[PDB]
Design a protein around this ligand. Structure first.
Ligand SMILES: *[C@@H]1O[C@H](CO)[C@@H](O)[C@H](O)[C@H]1NC(C)=O
Ligand SMILES: *[C@@H]1O[C@H](CO)[C@@H](O)[C@H](O)[C@H]1NC(C)=O
Ligand SMILES: *[C@@H]1O[C@H](CO)[C@@H](O)[C@H](O)[C@H]1NC(C)=O
Ligand SMILES: Clc1ccc([C@H]2C[C@@H]3CC[C@H]2N3)cn1
Ligand SMILES: Clc1ccc([C@H]2C[C@@H]3CC[C@H]2N3)cn1
Ligand SMILES: Clc1ccc([C@H]2C[C@@H]3CC[C@H]2N3)cn1
Ligand SMILES: Clc1ccc([C@H]2C[C@@H]3CC[C@H]2N3)cn1
Ligand SMILES: Clc1ccc([C@H]2C[C@@H]3CC[C@H]2N3)cn1
Ligand SMILES: [Ca+2]
Ligand SMILES: [Ca+2]
Ligand SMILES: [Ca+2]
Ligand SMILES: [Ca+2]
Ligand SMILES: [Ca+2]
Lengths: 386, 386, 386, 386, 386
């Protein structure tokens, strides 16, 4: 009864286009806040963050004011999208391909005129993904909200801290925080400042999954590569193992690239270490192969080039019936002679391959300690996850 | 005729914004229920549940009341979305990217004013997927329904048990149940309690498909690994078989990861067993390779390091014309001597590889019995499916 | 002219919510039919059928009746979605994620009041896919159409046979038929029966493509496996060929799984045969490997275990200067002795591998004849396609 | 000014449902044409053609007629979707899953009443893809446009030739033509003929990309297979090369299948040649393997079966101290005897493998000349592209 | 207050269809500009550019003019989509499949009547991708904006330079510029010129990512191929390494093809070099195989064909008790003779393989220098990125 009379009374001359202020010269104060419920996805490939959030717009409507005594039993009313004025607040850095993911809901109003609007949304935002310290990386993905057509002189957009009380842990990501910042900016379009509220979702990646799925294979690859660098040139399977380890490493680099963006602002350290040890082992497999097929015939066949020889040699010095039996026995002695000789090529391949092992060791230690001493602390993270 | 007169009469002063209650101070009772028709998909990768469901809202409209005698032959009327009042009930934990998948249908009303609303929907919900006990896992995926803008003081949302009479078995999933729970909650947004109805789809996975597609290959891999651990170091194909089994196991781990989420709250036991036996076999292939190329030349070459030797040895003890023929015959005797010797390295690789087999056996038994004695009972499940 | 006057006359007091019947107590007869134009897709993975169809609703509107003499030259009128009454007929088992794929078109009306409505649609329906007899399988995919809010007492939904005159052959599927069935059902929701019309698209798969793409490789794999089972244990490449055939077979099983659902109600016979011959060949490769590395040293080394020996043996029985030359000549005779011996292990591996070949042959014949004598007759199908 | 007065005047009694003709008994002439801008995609997998096109509807509105002198300065007016009458012309064979991709734009009208309507669209159409002559194939993909509810007695849909002046070459496809055909048809639905306009996009594929990406590998595979067929049975790597070439060929067949539909109306010649040479090389690898492990022991071991022997033989005929040295010398002579023998199996494998090479050559020549003499001429196409 | 009175006053007789000009004979000047915020994606496969942009339409409405003194405190008003006139400006070369990605926002108006409209959008445009100079390529992707139904006589569409002040670097692409061009064009549809504004996004690709992910493997492949060409025919692993390098190269070519379009207007130089060195190494592996199995038996077996022999030879010339011991010793001498011979086939394979290495070197140098001296300068680009 009184609800019907009130709804009829309020919409007599109401104009949804009108900014609801008694003084048209004064701006309208809008308290905009956010409630994060769940981080639904982080597409590092497309640099997209898919979140579930409830916005919170609170403002005052000078015309929607009634007296509870006049209308007993009704302390609230609801007004849908087009029946009253709502701020045109939206997400600037949206990637939704509709550019507005809000599900328009009812606006709740009470006698004093305080209007609440909590539109939910599956918001897809564009946030820059940093993979320099992968996979022990923290991402600061931004959500920039603001009014499109209402400026500071017409809409004083204030900020209230974001709400994470209802947040549901994702499992693959850990929500460090979601701080907000209200900033006043000017654009090369318009003479009025347009305030914005930027909420910076700061979240840290969880590494147990990638610790047992990815890093264990990686340590296996490293150990196999060290094993390859330990086998001598004459080893039968040192060339085969090098080749096989190469192909596995390459496949696994492609795996890393599948889930990582093509942005050139930085390179995943894991992939950089991959490529490094990759060139190192490939160079070692190639050197062993050139030593085994070109230097084999001559004890000083690979030493003919002036440069190759002097390099290796000086650098190593610095760094360290009767006649019948006659014929057959002579030929057998020649066989024995031809079967049991090694020359400076075995020693050279051992030196070169030892140098390759040393180069590989310089890279493993440096990368391991560097990833340990990363801005997203690795020691503390593993202490937490292990 | 009378239908036209009735439709004209009912919408005289009706306001769809008005909550239809004679006493505006009293809340409106809404009986919300659900009818599950088919589980359409379970994207474990994105942790999404795609279901087909018919909602069931039943309430009372004080203004839509007629007398059948006055309007003979019309016991019902239908009102579409915007012509009368419907509750703003929706799915909180939605992932639809429209955030409302309901197809708005007609509201059915009878003379007493009892209004029915059964909007169908392809609902995409966010539910946490537990893969700890994969693939013998049960999932409790939640569907949280509630009114967005109407609170307990305005909408007493009651719950009626869900309906599965029309449910169609998926084939890959078995519907254990769909119990409901009505809860009253407060939010850091608003001073009124907002009741919700949470239906917990509890469903168990079917394993015949994964029993013959996945587990049979797994047992094959395990048997091949045991075979690898049984072959001696001198075996020609023990190093090749280890490598090949490694690559197959890795591929198959990647297969598991393709269909499993990256959540770090737990690890699939199948994948954990993969990684375990993987490191075990790789360590065994590596040990055989170091024994075959570094220890080969010297009978006590690998025994030079103090630590390696003492470990193996003490632990094993605790755990257990004439002159022409002269020359040629002497050299042939030397050949015979050089061709028929084995040393402590064969025994050490047998001990080490035997220890690797023992470690692999400790893991196989433990994991097999553990998966047998899982909270989602495995013995009963196989009894059902086999 | 007269068209304008007629359009003005008809919408004087028309109410689209009103069911257009002179007697409100009587139901309205709606003849619902279907016209299938093209089967666009069959996603066996998600069990979805994507079709192009034109619905056909024919009914009678008591209020849209004019006299052609009064309005010469106008025998028809068109009314869009919201201007007049249309039945709320829709597809129950829809998977569209809008749950209504109809493109709302104009309703055609003639002087007698007979209204036609032929909304086209790309309908996505959920139909259970049976892969038991893959790839010689027929699918009965259902399309259940019905009114959502109008029951039998208000809407007598009759069925007219479906129209395939304009159907376009898909090429991968053959349309055996599309019979219809009108059924009256009750639901745990409502006191009125709600009739439905179910059209059962019965279509058979075409196998020429899969006959030359898939089955030819399969027969190749089978022949290679038989070849593996024919080679003796001492064969150099019998262990390598077994391993390679294994990996190829596994890859090809994964190919089958890529296009097949994970439903556990049945298993593709092709995949079952895969897994069978897979375990058989793997067991044979494993047996040859255990015979070649453990039994090699001793002529009765594998015969030490009591059980292994008795099994093989009894089952086979049921189933079937001078002194210098002295030294060197003696050692050469010892070499000759050591170089030219085979023992009961060659015979045992031949017996065991022969038994593996017999097991493989029992499965090939049984599966080939079974697939020949399938409910979707294979002999007639190949006669048609070959 | 005059524009406002004109817009007010025209919509006085206008009814968008009314067909705008002075004589309601006469049909309305609609000139429908098309402007193709870009072929955006050809999904051969789903048999879908994605095009960018501007429709062109031109007709006459008897009621939208003004006098320029009465309204100076306004020679045109614009009317959006629902303000005036537009024909319900749409694409019958659409695959858009909205079934109408037109972006509704303004209708342009001039004093004589001539109305223009040029709605743009990303049209997805279903067109049958012929891969028989792949990749030198031409596709005739149809676009069938027509009015849904207006028939010949009410809408005389004329055709004007399509416009390609603004067309942008795709690069992967060459637009041979886009001829149109206006046809009058009847349906098993309705008593009135419903004319249609069918534009047949006839386009030819470009093969430089597939000439250097695909065909070069193919010729490599063919040469490797010929090499395999040239190596003798005793060749060490003839069995390995055959196996490796097999696996590569299979992978590359799967590549062809990835981009080709599963339609069984025809088979890609490239894939047919693949499968042919595949069975040929596999049969040759298998024959060499049976000759190398079963016939090896006995010079007439493979000649025991009556059938195998007679076949090969007749068909080939039609087609073409002292005693110490005694012992040791005798055994060495036996070694020499056992080391240097070949028998009828080498000759038989050469004959059989030569026959396999001949079968492979019969197929290569036949397929190469056939693809040369294809309905989509290959010689002229390569002359153009090379 | 005054805002309400103003909003009521302005919409008294306003017609959104009316072009807002005092003189209907004169055209309306519309200043159209653009603000690029972020390049979201470049799908080279489908030749699509996904951008985030804010349009900027500025024009004048003769009817929306008020006096600030009459309405104090209100200097601006906002009008949504359908309440006033907006130009029908859209993107001609759109690929959105809705063909309009603009999110319709409010139109801002001030007392003088100057109307601003800044609709944001995720615009998907079709732009031709040039991969000739991959990956050091620059793309000129066009955005053609224009009015659909308003021509030059009615809409003088002027251009203002695009705004990149708020642009966010993508990371994978570098924004060289976004120049604009206003052009007047006629169409085979209409008698009036329809001006357009074309903004040409000129952007350069970043190569650090592809420099360490892609090019490093490529140089590895090249070095391995050179190594293959250095090994002699008798090398044991020269045939295996060639085969393995072949398969890796092919896989990596497929990787290039995965991210590259099938357009035949040009070929990626990287892929062309792939195919070249691929045929070269395959020809070398094939030649070594024919030399090793057909020429082996006879020292002049491959020299029998007249052509093969003369080619190689002339081109190379231009380019450069007692009797017992008797028997056994004689047979041993025959063994020695048979074991230590090479013939003109080793020299011929060295010559041929040397020629293959020379052909490979002619291609490596030519392609490396050509890519260095590309229109998108490579030396400067690497100087920037390295
Ligand atoms: C509210 O309305 C009641 C009843 O009309 C009246 O007595 C009271 O004065 C009003 N209060 C205010 C603050 O206007
Ligand atoms: C219903 O209407 C009939 C006819 O007007 C009247 O006789 C009867 O009293 C009414 N019943 C009620 C319960 O109002
Ligand atoms: C604006 O309005 C004020 C107040 O009515 C009036 O005094 C003044 O002359 C007006 N100015 C113009 C330029 O019309
Ligand atoms: Cl009508 C209008 C005026 C200004 C604007 C823009 C200024 C800031 C940046 C985007 C939006 N808010 C957009 N529309
Ligand atoms: Cl106007 C309004 C008031 C309250 C709410 C919220 C309170 C609970 C949680 C989501 C929704 N229901 C949302 N909108
Ligand atoms: Cl208002 C209303 C009443 C009944 C129904 C349901 C009964 C049958 C099954 C689905 C639909 N038709 C749906 N809505
Ligand atoms: Cl109301 C009505 C009448 C007829 C038709 C159909 C007849 C032809 C084929 C499709 C459409 N045009 C569709 N709707
Ligand atoms: Cl009503 C009408 C008239 C003309 C046009 C076209 C002419 C130019 C090219 C596309 C569009 N602008 C489109 N619609
Ligand atoms: Ca991710
Ligand atoms: Ca799944
Ligand atoms: Ca399919
Ligand atoms: Ca394609
Ligand atoms: Ca890209």
């Amino acid at each position: 009864e009184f609800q019907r009379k009130l709804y009829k009374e309020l919409v007599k001359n109401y104009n949804p286009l009108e900014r609801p202020v008694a003084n048209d010269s004064q701006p309208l104060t809008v308290y905009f806040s956010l409630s994060l419920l769940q981080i639904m996805d982080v597409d590092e490939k497309n640099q997209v963050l898919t979140t579930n959030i409830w916005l919170q717009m609170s403002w005052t409507d000078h015309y929607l004011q009634w007296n509870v005594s006049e209308y007993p039993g009704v302390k609230t009313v609801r007004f849908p999208d087009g029946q009253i004025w709502k701020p045109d607040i939206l997400l600037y850095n949206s990637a939704d391909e509709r550019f507005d993911a809000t599900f328009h809901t009812n606006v709740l109003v009470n006698s004093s005129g305080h209007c609440q609007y909590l539109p939910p949304g599956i918001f897809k935002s564009s946030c820059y993904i940093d993979v320099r310290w992968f996979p022990f990386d923290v991402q600061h993905c931004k959500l920039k909200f603001g009014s499109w057509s209402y400026g500071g002189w017409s809409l004083d957009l204030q900020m209230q801290e974001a709400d994470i009380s209802g947040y549901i842990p994702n499992g693959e990501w850990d929500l460090v925080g979601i701080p907000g910042k209200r900033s006043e900016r000017f654009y090369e379009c318009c003479k009025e400042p347009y305030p914005d509220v930027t909420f910076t979702v700061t979240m840290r990646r969880r590494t147990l999954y990638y610790g047992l799925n990815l890093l264990i294979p990686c340590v296996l690859i490293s150990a196999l590569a060290l094993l390859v660098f330990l086998l001598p040139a004459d080893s039968g399977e040192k060339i085969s193992l090098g080749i096989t380890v190469l192909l596995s490493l390459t496949v696994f680099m492609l795996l890393v690239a599948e889930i990582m963006p093509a942005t050139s602002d930085s390179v995943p350290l894991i992939a950089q270490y991959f490529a490094s040890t990759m060139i190192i082992v490939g160079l070692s497999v190639v050197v062993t192969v050139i030593v085994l097929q070109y230097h084999h015939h001559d004890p000083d066949g690979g030493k003919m080039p002036k440069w190759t020889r002097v390099i290796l040699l000086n650098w190593c010095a610095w760094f360290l019936i009767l006649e019948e039996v006659r014929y057959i026995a002579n030929r057998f002695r020649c066989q024995d002679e031809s079967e049991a000789v090694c020359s400076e090529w075995k020693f050279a391949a051992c030196v070169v391959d030892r140098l390759c092992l040393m180069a590989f060791s310089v890279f493993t230690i440096i990368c391991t300690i560097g990833i340990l001493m990363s801005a997203p602390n690795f020691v503390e993270a593993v202490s937490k996850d292990f």
